[PDB]
A and B are shown apart, each in its own frame.
Chain A
Amino acid sequence: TFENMAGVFMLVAGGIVAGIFLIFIEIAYKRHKDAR
């Protein structure tokens, strides 16, 4: 109804969008290490 749920929505959205970006490179490095 107001910002009460919007705050947690913004928090989780920022968390997931940061996590995917910071973990794509980690997944690529893991794949490269497994397939050197």
Chain B
Amino acid sequence: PSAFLEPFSASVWVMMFVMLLIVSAIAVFVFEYFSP
């Protein structure tokens, strides 16, 4: 078995890498917008 790989979990394996990026981007955007 391959630990922390597609067979272990999240067999799609091509969505979380961009999900983390987009959630980080939206968090940065809201943090910038809420500064004033």
Contacts and interface: CB of A to CB of B under 8 A. Distances in A.
Q: Is the interface of B mostly helix, strand, loop or mixed?
A: helix
Contacts of B26: 17
Contacts, number: 17
Interface size, B (range): under 10
B10 A1 contact: yes
Interface size, A (range): 10 to 19
Nearest to B33: A24
B9 interface: yes
B21 to A, nearest CB: 13
B23 A13 contact: yes
Interface of A: 1-2, 5, 9, 13, 17, 20-21, 24, 27-28
